[PDB]
Amino acid sequence: EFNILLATDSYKVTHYKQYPPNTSKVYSYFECREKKYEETVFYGLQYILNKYLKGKVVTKEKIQEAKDVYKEHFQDDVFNEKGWNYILEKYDGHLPIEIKAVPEGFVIPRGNVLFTVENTDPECYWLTNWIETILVQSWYPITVATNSREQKKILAKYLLETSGNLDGLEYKLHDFGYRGVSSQETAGIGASAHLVNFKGTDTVAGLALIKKYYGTKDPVPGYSVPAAEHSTITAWGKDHEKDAFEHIVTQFSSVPVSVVSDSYDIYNACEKIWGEDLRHLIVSRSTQAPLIIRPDSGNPLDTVLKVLEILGKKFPVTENSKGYKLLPPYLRVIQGDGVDINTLQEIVEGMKQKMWSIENIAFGSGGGLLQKLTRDLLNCSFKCSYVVTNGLGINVFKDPVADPNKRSKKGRLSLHRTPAGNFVTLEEGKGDLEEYGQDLLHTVFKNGKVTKSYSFDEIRKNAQLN
Amino acid sequence: EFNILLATDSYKVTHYKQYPPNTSKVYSYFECREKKYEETVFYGLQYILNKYLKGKVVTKEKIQEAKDVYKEHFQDDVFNEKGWNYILEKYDGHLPIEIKAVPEGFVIPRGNVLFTVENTDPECYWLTNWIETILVQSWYPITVATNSREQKKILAKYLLETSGNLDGLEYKLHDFGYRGVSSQETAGIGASAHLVNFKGTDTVAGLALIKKYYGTKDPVPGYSVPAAEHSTITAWGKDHEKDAFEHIVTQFSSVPVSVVSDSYDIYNACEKIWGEDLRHLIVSRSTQAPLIIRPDSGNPLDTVLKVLEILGKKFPVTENSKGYKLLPPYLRVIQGDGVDINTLQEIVEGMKQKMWSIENIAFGSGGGLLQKLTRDLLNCSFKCSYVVTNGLGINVFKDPVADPNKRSKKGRLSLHRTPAGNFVTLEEGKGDLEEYGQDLLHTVFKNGKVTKSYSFDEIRKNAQLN
Ligand SMILES: NC(=O)c1cccnc1
Ligand SMILES: NC(=O)c1cccnc1
């Protein structure tokens, strides 16, 4: 079972003894600090609030276990047993904390307050930053959602340019990342964050998280199609790749089917096996049930371009109204190896230069989509901006001499719409002057209760492209 | 509650209809494919076996849950209800699988079999690769442990060169990564993998995982010390940094204490505040209770060198037996910003060139230690190598034309010691010939039961440096 008393950085166990005496309030905020990613999708906090922070999160047993562990961990009795027991006795183990946040799905420029955290009881001044560690982990769903959306922008740009519309955009980047992430929990969080922007996923873990914590009007937020892996091709034997191919496309004759084609020779498979030997089983397929040929090795750009040139000479290629080449509707390609935001850009641009429509291609991304991301990418940071000591409010901040980018905001904060319709973070409690509209931050957590929540449908709407 | 039927890549739901008819066995293996990082620490499988694979993992309720999800996910009834019901009825929901693995903590060169997976019931041929996704996630603990060990090698080399011994090496790289990972589960797994090599951690999540899944003779596998963060310094107000410093070191006067010193001006804090104003409180400290000054911004190498030069002129520096400069025992430095394997090397080499002992410094690493890693770093790969179809065993492999690095091993595999005492992986069942010793792989999982286990003490012993 999860224990919030054991869910912090070790040093935070010692911070209650470090704050100025007579401190009744610690007020902290999260931002994606400003310096390629100019705007961030805020997503994932609601999950953390519900799974970890709400309800009775303190018990007498959890206090004793924390006390016993930390005694050995520090070789000292530094753990604040009295402070945690206070919360247990006075509030039935509910956290005296208020968290205000931008609505989930909102797309916010860098260097703006996304959420704030404060204690609601003067005794629990230390609690605000105790929960920093758990809350800062929101960097991950934010970053996956943001990076996924930025890839959607690239796909939208090139699909519109080469075809004149955005039909099927929401299926152009498929989540392949289940095996390539660090844990089962990460898989669920990561997959759910990608689904803010797209609807195609193989990371099943994402579906249950969305159902449990967010909710959709539709039965499921994500979809997939039958597809082969190397084991289902190679198990037939080296000389029987054609038999594997034939069997699989016949088994899935009425639905879309992806078939990995690089087991031995991708270019042979395309030209001779698909393009000659089994051509009759491809040309007969429905437009609702195409064969999707899947390369999975070599240089991603070179392989995609070569595969298209091969297929273009074996199948009846048309030229769309934009002047770009289009494969027959029963035949498509998915590149699912070495795909990240950088290589995705490289491939669609290379396709455009060779006059291939982006209609022809879908992408699969695993590690690049869900794992190859850090807290540094969007400069995700959680800092104390305001304290009350001796009944006096003090605006606090860091400003390291050797890094001006690490300078943090001062005082009580609020997020506002600007007259031109952009975003501004007001500092030093200036949001109280009411010179701007309403504060865009809403109370989402207060005293152990989730006070405002959002469906996954609302989040998707908020995170739409312009 | 976890459902193994929902813990796979979507397309693997469709694979039972793709294998050759009359397939009674699918046999697969995991390796860290060949061509730094010459040798890998095998760690983490035991966690996966115990948490996810053992016991009754199939129930009537879980089959129905998976059926309902995949019906909407695929918009079709492709889910193998009959296959999963067979396991529930015949084996009381226990997986008819055998897993053989190298002992955990073992240091194995790249391109060797680390574990194998096979079905024990002909009806469950499809199950071997169903569980690929869950098992491949072992890439993460393997990769953290390996990267952590490689950093220990660097630290050992330079500490030995500059001091003549390895005293305190196991505390030279501290885990700062709790907030910088993608989830709570990842934090535990990642932190536990680092603790194979070191004993200093702030990622508390790692302690419980080890206690639950591995076990140690010691009450706790990892340790920490009191330390400040920016909030506990800045909360005092910009003009009161000295007061914050004084309060914290007096509160923790008899234990080691780390104090982040870069809130406003790291160089001023070292020279004027620590070096002059509060010097009397530092020079009086015990050798068992040093002040550890923590920079946290700027160029990691440049900042460390300048901090050391400053402290060298304000405090009584000695020269050790190797001719390197050493701060008094009550004063140390921890660099915990921008630390990864590359910058770690850069800092220790830079210190050596300026004649500073590695005794003076410790490192903290967060995202670099636990997050900035992918499955591709060690080329972690899970592949089918052997099947039985029509009662006939065939050696199975992939060999993509444009990537010879992606070629997989053929047939039944075993790991052996060579006459020179190294490791070799024998293919095509050649291990049966006994021209080498016995297979070094142990059966660790069979038919729902964990059959072989390792303590965290044994794993640490196995993973030691030469
Ligand atoms: N469906 C796929 O082709 C797939 C899914 C997950 C990982 N790799 C490939
Ligand atoms: N102990 C520390 O100084 C610390 C821990 C976790 C993250 N950052 C710093």
User: For B135-174, what is the HEC assignment?
Assistant: HHCCHHHHHHHHHHHHHHHHHHHHHHHHHCCCCCHHHCEE
Among chain B residues, CA nearest to A384: B231
DSSP state of A166: -
φ, ψ of residue B108 to 5 degrees: the values are -120, 130
Q: Do B298 and A267 count as a contact with CB atoms less than 8 A apart?
A: no
Where do breaks (C to N over 2.5 Å) occur in chain B, by preceding residue number? 35
Strand partners, A293: A259, A333
Q: H or E stretch including A258?
A: strand A257-260
Counting ligand 2 atoms within 8 A of each CB, the residue from B176, B252, B296 with the most, and so the one to mutate, is: B176
Ligand 2 contacts CB of residue A18 (under 6 A): no
Please state whether B237 falls in left (phi above 0), alpha (psi between -120 and 50) or beta.
left
Rounded to the nearest angstrom, the distance between the alpha carbon of A339 and the centre of ligand 1 is 12
A237 touches chain B (CB under 8 A): yes
A264 close contact with B: CB closer than 8 A: yes
Tell me the C-alpha to C-alpha distance, in Å, between residue B63 and each of A47, A221, B85, B169: 26, 20, 7, 50
A134 SS3 class: helix
- Give the Cα-Cα-Cα angle B185, B187, B193 (nearest 5 degrees): 105
What region does A80 belong to: left with phi over 0, alpha with psi -120 to 50, or beta? beta
> If you measure from the C-alpha of residue A368 to the centroid of ligand 2, how many angstroms do you get, rounded to a whole number?
28
* φ and ψ at residue B301, rounded to 5 degrees: -65, -50
CB within 8 A of B88, min separation 6: which ones?
Answer: B58, B59, B60, B63
B269 to A15, A16, B243: CA distances (angstroms): 20, 23, 12
Tokens of B453: 């286990």
Q: Tokens for A121?
A: 């009881």
d(CA B173, CA A3): 26
Give the CA distances from residue B29 to residues A229, B61, B100, in Å, rounded to whole numbers and listed in that order.
15, 31, 9
Q: How far apart are alpha carbons A389 and B202 in whole angstroms?
A: 28
Query: Measured from the CA of B366, which atom of ligand 2 is nearest?
Result: 7
Q: Cα(B430) to centroid of ligand 1, in Å?
A: 32
Which chain B residue has the Cα nearest residue A299?
B402
Decide the pairing of beta strands B331-335 and B361-365: parallel
Contact A294, A327 (CB under 8 A): no
Paired residues of A466 in beta bridges: none
Among A4, A9, A65, A251, the strongest candidate for a mutation testing the B interface, having the largest count of B CBs within 10 A, is: A9
Alpha helices in B164-299 (DSSP H): 184-194, 205-213, 230-234, 241-251, 266-268, 279-282
Q: Is the dihedral of CA B445, B449, B451, B453 positive or negative?
A: positive
Give chain A's end-to-end CA distance (angstroms, integer): 43
Per the CB < 8 A criterion, the answer to whether B242 and B273 are in contact is yes
DSSP 8-state class, residue B203: B
Nearest C-alpha neighbor of B111 from the set B163, B191, B39, B33? B33
Kindly state whether A375 is in contact with chain B, defined as any CB-CB distance less than 8 angstroms.
yes
> Which of helix, strand or coil describes residue A444?
strand
Closest-CA residue of chain A to B219: A72
Q: Do B180 and A226 touch (CB under 8 A)?
A: no
Q: Say how far apart CA B250 and CA B266 lie, in whole Å.
A: 20
User: What residue ranges define each of the domains in chain A, with the CATH number in brackets?
Assistant: 1-136+375-453 (no CATH), 137-374+454-466 (3.20.20.70)
**Cβ-contact A216, A190 below 8 angstroms:** no
Q: Does A220 touch chain B (CB under 8 A)?
A: yes
Reading phi first (left if > 0) and then psi (alpha if -120 to 50, else beta), residue B315 is in: beta
Minimum CA distance residue for ligand 1 atom 8: A176
Q: What is the 3-state secondary structure (H, E, C) of B60-111?
A: HHHHHHHHHHHHHHHCCCCCCHHHHHHHHHHHCCCCCEEEEECCCCCEEECC
- Count other Cβ atoms within 10 Å, centred on residue B105: 22
- Among the partner residues A26, A219, A402, nearest to B235 by beta-carbon distance: A26
CB contact under 8 A, B14 and A252: yes
* Residue B349: how many other CB atoms lie within 10 Å: 14
For an interface test with B, the pick among A119, A178, A231 (most B C-beta atoms closer than 10 Å) comes out as A231
Residue type at B404?
P
Cβ contact A441:A423 at 8 Å: no
Method of structure determination:
X-ray
With a CB cutoff of 8 Å and minimum separation 6, the contacts of A119 are: A25, A26, A96, A97, A98, A125, A126, A127, A128
- φ and ψ at residue A339, rounded to 5 degrees: -90, 115
Q: Which of B339, B336, B346 is nearest to B368 (CA)?
A: B339
CB B412 within 8 A of CB B27: yes
Q: Which ligand 1 atom sits nearest the alpha carbon of residue A176?
A: 6
Closest CB to A400 among B203, B222, B262:
B262
Resolution of the experimental model, in Å, one decimal: 2.0
> Do the Cβ atoms of B183 and A189 come within 8 Å?
yes
User: E-assigned strands of B301-430?
Assistant: 318-319, 325-326, 331-335, 361-365, 380-389, 392-395, 414-417, 423-426
Chain A contact set for B74 (CB, 8 A): 223-226, 255
Rounded distance between C-alpha atoms, residue B52 and residue B450, angstroms: 11
The residues in A 157-176 lying below 8 A from B, measured between CB atoms, are: 176
Tell me which residue has tokens 């183990």: A93
User: Which of B17, B126, B128, B184 to mutate against chain A (most A CBs within 10 Å)?
Assistant: B184
* DSSP H stretches of helix in B378-443: none
How far, rounded to the nearest angstrom, does the alpha carbon of residue A83 sit from its chain's CA centroid? 35
Query: Torsions phi, psi of A3, nearest 5?
Result: -125, 110
Q: Are B205 and A7 in contact (CB under 8 A)?
A: yes
Q: Please, where are the H alpha helices in A38-183?
A: 45-48, 60-74, 81-91, 127-130, 132-136, 139-163
Nearest to B179 among A132, A263, A268 (CB): A132
Cα separation of B204 and B224, whole Å? Answer: 9
CA torsion through residues B92, B94, B97, B103, sign: negative
Instruction: With CA atoms as reference, report the closest residue to A74 among B217, B202, B363.
Output: B202
- Asked if the Cβ–Cβ distance from B235 to A394 is below 8 Å, we say yes
CB A231 within 8 A of CB B129: yes
d(CA A137, CA A147): 16
For A461, list phi and psi in degrees, rounded to 5. -65, -45
Residue B201 near ligand 2, beta carbon < 6 Å: no
Q: What is the C-alpha separation between A322 and A360, in angstroms, rounded?
A: 14
Distance CA A324, CA A311 (A): 15
Euclidean distance between CA atoms A10 and B223, whole angstroms? 9
Closest-CA residue, ligand 2 atom 3, reads B227
**How many Å apart are CA A89 and CA B447, to the nearest integer?**
48
CA distance B199 to B213: 18
Please answer yes or no on whether B223 and A73 come within 8 Å at the CB atom: yes
Asked if A383's CB is within 8 angstroms of B205's CB, the reply is no
Q: Comparing C-alpha atoms, which of B236, B72, B261, B41 is closest to residue B144?
A: B41
Locus of tokens 């019931």: B121
Dist. CA B177–CA A376, nearest whole Å: 12
B431 three-state secondary structure: helix
- Nearest CA-CA distance, residue A435 and chain B, Å: 28
CB B23 within 8 A of CB B123: no
Q: Do A406 and B244 touch (CB under 8 A)?
A: no
CB B17 within 8 A of CB B114: no
Distance between CA B137 and CA B8 in Å, rounded?
A: 11
Contact residues, chain B, for A47 at CB < 8 Å: none
> Residue for token digits 């005492």?
B421
- 3-class DSSP state of A372: coil
Coil vs helix vs strand at B433? helix
B387: distance to nearest CA of chain A, Å?
6
Residue B132 is encoded by which pair of tokens? Answer: 């690929």
Cβ proximity of A321 and A304 under 8 Å: no
Around Cβ B460, how many Cβ atoms within 10 Å? 19
Assess contact for A61 and A159: CB atoms under 8 A. Answer: no
